[PDB]
From Swiss-Prot:
It comes from Human enterovirus D68 (EV68). Residues 2-180 form the Peptidase C3 domain. This is Protease 3C. It catalyses: Selective cleavage of Gln-|-Gly bond in the poliovirus polyprotein. In other picornavirus reactions Glu may be substituted for Gln, and Ser or Thr for Gly. Disulfide bonds: none annotated.
Length: 181
């Protein structure tokens, strides 16, 4: 509808796949080469489905900060025959707050879904499903099951992936450029 939705759509149409694990279907962001991200609660194993094709997992790393605290981001290298467009130059270098973000989801349940979530707070610490978690972004939208893995963008920046909600607020894990060197 406007330039925020324009940037979000450009990311969805080239840099997402539908990932299926034994824990469900997730929006999965491809970042560069065969490297993608997914919430750590997806419990990626040795095999994953990518757009309903059986795909070997070459590497999966559940990130933690240097306090050894959960970040809720898993970096997956896929045995896929095709590279992603390199979008690392759209990743923030530091923790920050943002204005006027969009959360974008693409699954079998929610295809072509875009949500203007407004202001994004650097929330920091969250007890996420009982797990202490750092580098959490918060937005005041009532997000629902099916949105985990959704991509959070502003114009020109890919800032996080949706990992949870409390019925009134939604929470994303930060993406930082330093995760993908």
């Amino acid at each position: 509808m406007g330039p925020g939705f324009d940037f979000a759509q450009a990311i969805m149409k080239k840099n997402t796949v539908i990932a299926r694990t034994e824990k469900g279907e997730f929006t999965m962001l491809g970042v560069y080469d065969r490297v993608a991200v997914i919430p750590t609660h997806a419990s990626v194993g040795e095999i994953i489905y990518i757009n309903d094709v059986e795909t070997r997992v070459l590497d999966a790393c559940a990130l933690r900060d240097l306090t050894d605290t959960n970040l809720e981001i898993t970096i997956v290298k896929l045995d896929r025959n095709q590279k992603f467009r390199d979008i690392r130059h759209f990743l923030p270098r530091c923790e920050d707050d943002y204005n006027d973000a969009v959360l974008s989801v693409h699954t079998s349940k929610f295809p072509n879904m875009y949500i203007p979530v407004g202001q994004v707070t650097n929330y920091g610490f969250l007890n996420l499903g009982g797990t202490p978690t750092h580098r959490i972004l918060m937005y005041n939208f009532p997000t629902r099951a099916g949105q985990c893995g959704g991509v959070v963008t502003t114009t020109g920046k890919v800032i996080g992936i949706h990992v949870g909600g409390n019925g009134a607020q939604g929470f994303a894990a930060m993406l930082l450029h330093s995760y993908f060197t």
